[PDB]
TrEMBL record, chain D:
Residues 108-119 have a biased composition (Basic residues). This is Small ribosomal subunit protein uS12. The keyword Secreted does not apply. One of its GO terms (molecular function) is rRNA binding. Mg(2+) 2 binds at P44, N45. Keywords: Metal-binding, Ribonucleoprotein, Ribosomal protein, RNA-binding, rRNA-binding, tRNA-binding. Residues 105-124 are annotated as: Disordered. Belongs to the universal ribosomal protein uS12 family. CDD domains: Ribosomal_S12 (cd03368). GO terms for cellular component: small ribosomal subunit. It comes from Thermus thermophilus (strain SG0.5JP17-16). Mg(2+) 3 binds at N45. InterPro entries: NA-bd_OB-fold, Ribosomal_uS12, Ribosomal_uS12_bac. With S4 and S5 plays an important role in translational accuracy. Interacts with and stabilizes bases of the 16S rRNA that are involved in tRNA selection in the A site and with the mRNA backbone. Located at the interface of the 30S and 50S subunits, it traverses the body of the 30S subunit contacting proteins on the other side and probably holding the rRNA structure together. The combined cluster of proteins S8, S12 and S17 appears to hold together the shoulder and platform of the 30S subunit.
RNA sequence: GGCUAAUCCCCCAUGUGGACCCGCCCCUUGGGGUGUGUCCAAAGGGCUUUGCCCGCUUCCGGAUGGGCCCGCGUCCCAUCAGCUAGUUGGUGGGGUAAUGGCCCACCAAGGCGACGACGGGUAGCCGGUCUGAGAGGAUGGCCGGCCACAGGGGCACUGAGACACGGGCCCCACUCCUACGGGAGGCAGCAGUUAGGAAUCUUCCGCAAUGGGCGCAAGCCUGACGGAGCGACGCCGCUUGGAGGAAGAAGCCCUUCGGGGUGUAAACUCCUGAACCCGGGACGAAACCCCCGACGAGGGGACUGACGGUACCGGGGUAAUAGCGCCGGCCAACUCCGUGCCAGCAGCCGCGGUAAUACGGAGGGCGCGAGCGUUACCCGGAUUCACUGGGCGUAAAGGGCGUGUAGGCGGCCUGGGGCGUCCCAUGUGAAAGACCACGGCUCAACCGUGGGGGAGCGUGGGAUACGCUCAGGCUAGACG
């Protein structure tokens, strides 16, 4: 199984590359609540087909750059900009919390 | 003292020189063909180019290259020769190239 | 707002019994109704019915007690001596089939809600499935 | 604390301090006396307690108790340090070990001789 | 080596008769006749009510002192028993009773458990035809515990054997006195055994 | 060169051998590919050797080579008899 | 500077086939086919030399070994809050077996971070181990797996493979040689020395076995290894005797002066017979080779020990080492004398300032026993970081109040999906350990053989109550 993941495209800034966001829920190892984490996958959009606020499948791949191991399989859904707004905000919140 | 795989070093030296030579030959020739291509003097470029190809496969025969090593060097060369042959190329010898 | 409705049922029941009521209204839903069906079957409540209260529908859980008693404290034994939630929102719990619990060495139960439906401990074992471990009762 | 709080924060495992820097963790260290002396015990008792300040091979210098009755030790003696405190004296965290190195055993002592480092008496 | 010294004093300290002494632990000299109180200055003085600990201790003690076995051997054998599938007290007892020295005793070749340990030790004893000297050898049911024909002529051996004429052997064994051959037919039970010991007190000792 | 050989599993003065398939270059006593047999020099049991031929045959098909001792055991069990 | 052989090097030839550029087809990341053009091979040696053995060349597959990449897991500090220039992507290129800012130029301006980036501290990781009723805590010595390093730092060459512990270049520290020009080293390999330390072995034996290198072989090499030596370091077995023997010697102990204790203990009686002496005396070892058959199969068939004259069998044979802690409570075991806030004891409580069962001896007692105590460290106890399993009115603990971001959490009805969750199948979960059974050394320790278990993760199939989710209702919450 080359691994597939599903995520939301939260950054298109780069050339031929999209920042993809993939959530994982998993039961916590002691306390046993289900905790829901995530990471940004850096994923290879050759034709600049994919656009921000999409939702994609991402597939484990032959390496593209340092940091790109994954390319973009399909379009599961287009149009979740809410999700993007979440991420944009989490990072927006960073601007507090310092000095 | 005087452990006698001392001899091994002794040999490894000679081998060194032999590889180095063979490989220099290769380079100087390759570049020769390339310049010749830039110039678009087509048939000349080709005859060098074939000497180069051959000398490469020869280098391959032994421990200078082997492998895909040579094949890489060859594909690179030929591509570049042919590409370089458009400024009105009309590839005269066409010895090395599939028509 | 109400928050874990199933806890709130089991609780309405816990209180009701300790002050020895004949019955109580827990506001209703098919999942509670299923939890109850199992209670009745298992002998903890008398039974339950569907009622309406100022139009909005509930469930009368009719209650079981022991017989009256000797000396000071005539209050009869409880039938549900113990009732408690296990999985809760905010910590959910799931047993595999080989983890389903022996409650009070068997004299109590565990309501598991499974993909096969809501069943008791033994019921799930004999059925061979796992689930969300809802409460134990005894 | 809620559970979400235990996930967020989680219990604190608890450290401890070593009542003994003999450092090194070692079961004993060797060292060289400086002072051999006596001191006045803490409140609930009265007596004369024999003890040596020591330089230890650990780059470490400590008052250490001299158990038994008869003690030979003097200012250049080299002794082996034990660990364990004398509850009513100030700053003595370790014991000297009799029979080892310069500290000799308690002479005339017939009873608990593993401790006190005294060999066994003959008989005929 | 497990305790070698004035035994009849242990008859005394455990308060009860444990004959490691053979005859004379029969003949009314055991001192357990007319001097049953324990040894030392304070033996004849009053008994302070024994701690729960004390109780458990001296029961474990009685039970070990019987078999003359090292505490090491004993407790290792014991935890053996508590792993072993089934009821610990009994399992244990069966194990101790399964000791070769013990079987030699039970079979009546020697008058003391201890004497029999010497018998095993000095190779006067064979099992299924093969000599064994290790007192701790495990006799498995079906095994045949026999005297060694080389020593079958021995004073002491035939001695004890003749006194063993017409006497009956425990039911988990069989004996033939003309051939000294014997057989350990089964591992014995609590009931099969008369032991003046509450085993759960010993299990209880090892709880803590 | 993937070999077949005795590796040493007993105790001191009590050898027992796992006859095994392993790369030439492992330790004698370290990770093997497959254990096809066992050997008992002092022959303390009626089972002092075993093979699973059709396995030894496989590993021969792919050109494992045995020890001379190993070959001896193999032939004892006759991976070799063709008749 | 000169001579010269080769399975050393080179050049033509042949092209089974293969490499490469462009075309076509299939496949789908650089997989496979094909056509044309170009380029590519080789080594000889031994025999009984008419035939075989040993090799050599190009290719295709196999096997085993590895490179690289991805998900997930992997300690403490937030009194470390921001970090980032090859840094983040791209185009072309160099490099490699091979993807890749791995590198280089040029272009864009990105990438990461409270879900803890950066920083600092510690640290080889795992199989497992110890502890625990479990969850958990602690750890990673030996054996097995992986990594990493070989005086410190850099570097490449050779090669299938290395950036190479007993190979090479350079810098640095140190030791030694030095005609002062310059050279030589590299035990974290087996032993051994030296320092440091509380402390850790022999400069032994052997190539007989097993394994590895080269060899057609015979065979050489192997401080891998198999053994022996040392140290109660640990485990396991074993001995210091067995039975009889006083209403109980003497000495020593208390004494209420009647006696009580040591104690069946001893003496002595009798029996066995550790050590030790004597003879026999191993397995481990049947291959390689031998011959017959064809150097196969098969069949027979002989040589080959370090450990060792050891283990063991037979014979003969001597009553033949006991220690250590403790006895106020926790805690099993009490009395006399001595000392008199001294000397001392002491884990905690707390003993000793004249009757001390707590100090020191003695008699006696308990516990263990070739051990027994001590210190250190780990878990336990400790439900005292509380997932199992704690708390916050006065005991430590509600933030001075609010608004509200992330986040956590979410009423009733129906439907889709099936992500969580559950079930089945299968792969994986090496071996060793652990658990079960049987067995092998007289037993065990130790070993073998077999069985079983197992969280987790891959794949396929299935269920849909709850939890997600998407679509649609509702009005009991909320707002109006
Ligand atoms: Mg873009
Ligand atoms: Mg790229
Ligand atoms: Mg910022
Ligand atoms: Mg050579
Ligand atoms: Mg040039
Ligand atoms: Mg490339
Ligand atoms: Mg009903
Ligand atoms: Mg729970
Ligand atoms: Mg005072
Ligand atoms: Mg049991
Ligand atoms: Mg059972
Ligand atoms: Mg029976
Ligand atoms: Mg226990
Ligand atoms: Mg390898
Ligand atoms: Mg097998
Ligand atoms: Mg074959
Ligand atoms: Mg010359
Ligand atoms: Mg010359
Ligand atoms: Mg050549
Ligand atoms: Mg050619
Ligand atoms: Mg062709
Ligand atoms: Mg093609
Ligand atoms: Mg062609
Ligand atoms: Mg030629
Ligand atoms: Mg190949
Ligand atoms: Mg691979
Ligand atoms: Mg990771
Ligand atoms: Mg830079
Ligand atoms: Mg740059
Ligand atoms: Mg590139
Ligand atoms: Mg994250
Ligand atoms: Mg480190
Ligand atoms: Mg560590
Ligand atoms: Mg355990
Ligand atoms: Mg606990
Ligand atoms: Mg705990
Ligand atoms: Mg761990
Ligand atoms: Mg760890
Ligand atoms: Mg390690
Ligand atoms: Mg290791
Ligand atoms: Mg690996
Ligand atoms: Mg280094
Ligand atoms: Mg060094
Ligand atoms: Mg270096
Ligand atoms: Mg090579
Ligand atoms: Mg190379
Ligand atoms: Mg390379
Ligand atoms: Mg290296
Ligand atoms: Mg070296
Ligand atoms: Mg040099
Ligand atoms: Mg020293
Ligand atoms: Mg050694
Ligand atoms: Mg050899
Ligand atoms: Mg060999
Ligand atoms: Mg020959
Ligand atoms: Mg040599
Ligand atoms: Mg060795
Ligand atoms: Mg010692
Ligand atoms: Mg022992
Ligand atoms: Mg006697
Ligand atoms: Mg007397
Ligand atoms: Mg005799
Ligand atoms: Mg043989
Ligand atoms: Mg032999
Ligand atoms: Mg032979
Ligand atoms: Mg012939
Ligand atoms: Mg043959
Ligand atoms: Mg033969
Ligand atoms: Mg040989
Ligand atoms: Mg010999
Ligand atoms: Mg003998
Ligand atoms: Mg004899
Ligand atoms: Mg004697
Ligand atoms: Mg007491
Ligand atoms: Mg004391
Ligand atoms: Mg006085
Ligand atoms: Mg006094
Ligand atoms: Mg007083
Ligand atoms: Mg006293
Ligand atoms: Mg005391
Ligand atoms: Mg005292
Ligand atoms: Mg005494
Ligand atoms: Mg010890
Ligand atoms: Mg602790
Ligand atoms: Mg809790
Ligand atoms: Mg848990
Ligand atoms: Mg509390
Ligand atoms: Mg107050
Ligand atoms: Mg308070
Ligand atoms: Mg307040
Ligand atoms: Mg306050
Ligand atoms: Mg609010
Ligand atoms: Mg919110
Ligand atoms: Mg709900
Ligand atoms: Mg699913
Ligand atoms: Mg499975
Ligand atoms: Mg296993
Ligand atoms: Mg093992
Ligand atoms: Mg084992
Ligand atoms: Mg056995
Ligand atoms: Mg599945
Ligand atoms: Mg459905
Ligand atoms: Mg549904
Ligand atoms: Mg369905
Ligand atoms: Mg939600
Ligand atoms: Mg709605
Ligand atoms: Mg309305
Ligand atoms: Zn008696």
């Amino acid at each position: 199984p080359k691994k597939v993941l599903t995520g939301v495209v939260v950054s298109d800034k780069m050339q031929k590359t999209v920042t993809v966001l993939v959530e994982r829920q998993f039961p916590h190892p002691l306390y046993g609540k289900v905790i829901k984490r995530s990471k940004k996958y850096l994923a290879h959009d050759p034709e600049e087909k994919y656009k921000l606020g999409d939702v994609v499948e991402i597939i484990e791949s032959r390496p593209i750059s340092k940091r790109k191991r994954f390319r973009v399989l399909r379009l599961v859904e287009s149009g979740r900009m809410d999700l993007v707004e979440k991420y944009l905000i989490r990072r927006q919140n960073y601007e507090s919390l310092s000095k | 003292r005087n452990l006698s795989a001392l001899k091994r070093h002794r040999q490894s030296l000679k081998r060194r020189l032999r590889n180095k030579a063979k490989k220099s030959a290769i380079k100087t020739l390759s570049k020769k063909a390339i310049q010749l291509a830039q110039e678009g003097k087509a048939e000349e470029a080709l005859k060098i180019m074939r000497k180069a190809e051959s000398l490469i496969d020869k280098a391959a025969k032994g421990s200078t290259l082997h492998k895909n090593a040579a094949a890489r060097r060859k594909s690179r060369l030929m591509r570049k020769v042919r590409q370089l042959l458009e400024a009105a190329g009309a590839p005269l010898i066409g010895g090395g190239l599939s028509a | 707002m109400l928050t874990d409705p199933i806890a709130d049922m089991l609780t309405r029941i816990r209180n009701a019994t300790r002050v020895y009521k004949e019955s109580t209204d827990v506001p209703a839903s098919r999942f509670k109704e299923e939890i109850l069906r199992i209670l009745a079957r298992e002998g903890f409540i008398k039974g339950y019915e569907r009622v309406d209260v100022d139009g909005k529908p509930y469930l009368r859980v009719y209650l079981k007690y022991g017989p009256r008693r000797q000396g000071p404290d005539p209050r009869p034994e409880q039938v549900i001596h113990h009732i408690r939630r296990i999985s809760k929102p905010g910590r959910r719990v799931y047993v595999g089939v080989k983890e389903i619990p022996r409650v009070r060495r068997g004299l109590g139960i565990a309501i598991l809600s499974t993909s096969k439906g809501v069943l008791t401990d033994r019921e799930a074992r004999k059925l061979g499935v796992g689930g969300e471990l809802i409460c134990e009762v005894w | 604390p809620t559970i979400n709080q235990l996930v967020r924060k989680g219990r604190e495992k608890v450290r401890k301090k070593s009542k003994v820097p003999a450092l090194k963790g070692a079961p004993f260290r060797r060292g060289v006396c400086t002072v051999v002396r006596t001191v006045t015990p803490k409140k609930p008792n009265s007596a004369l307690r024999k003890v040596a300040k020591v330089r230890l091979t650990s780059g470490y210098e400590v008052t250490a108790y001299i158990p038994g009755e008869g003690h030979n030790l003097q200012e250049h003696s080299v002794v082996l340090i034990r660990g364990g405190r004398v509850k009513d004296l100030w700053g003595v965290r370790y014991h000297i070990v009799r029979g080892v190195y310069d500290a000799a055993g308690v002479k005339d002592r017939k009873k608990s001789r593993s401790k006190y480092g005294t060999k066994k008496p003959k008989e005929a | 080596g497990r305790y070698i010294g004035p035994v009849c004093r242990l008859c005394r300290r455990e308060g009860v008769k444990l004959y490691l002494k053979g005859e004379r632990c029969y003949s009314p000299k055991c001192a357990m006749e007319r001097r049953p109180y324990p040894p030392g200055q304070h033996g004849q003085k009053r008994a302070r009510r024994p701690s729960d600990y004390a109780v458990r201790l001296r029961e474990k003690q009685k039970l070990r002192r019987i078999y003359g076995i090292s505490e090491r051997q004993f407790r290792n054998l014991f935890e053996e028993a508590s792993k072993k599938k089934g009821v610990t007290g009994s399992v244990f007892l069966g194990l101790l009773e399964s000791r070769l020295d013990n079987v030699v005793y039970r079979l009546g070749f020697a008058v003391s458990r201890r004497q029999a340990r010497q018998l095993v030790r000095h190779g006067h004893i064979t099992v299924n035809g093969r000599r064994v000297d290790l007192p701790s050898y495990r006799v498995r049911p079906g095994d045949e515990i026999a005297v060694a024909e080389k020593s079958r002529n021995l004073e002491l051996i035939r001695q004890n054997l003749e006194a063993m004429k017409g006497r009956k052997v425990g039911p988990w064994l069989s004996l033939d006195v003309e051939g000294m051959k014997g057989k350990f037919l089964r591992l014995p039970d609590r009931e099969d055994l008369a032991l003046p010991v509450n085993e759960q007190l010993v299990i209880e000792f090892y709880s803590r | 060169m993937v070999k077949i050989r005795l590796a040493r599993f007993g105790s001191k003065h009590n050898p027992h051998y796992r006859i095994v398939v392993t790369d030439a270059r492992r330790k004698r006593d370290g990770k093997y590919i497959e254990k096809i047999g066992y050997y008992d020099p002092r022959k303390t049991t009626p089972d002092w050797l075993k093979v699973d031929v059709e396995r030894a045959r496989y590993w021969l098909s792919v050109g494992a080579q045995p020890t001379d001792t190993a070959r001896r055991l193999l032939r004892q069990a006759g991976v070799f008899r063709q008749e």
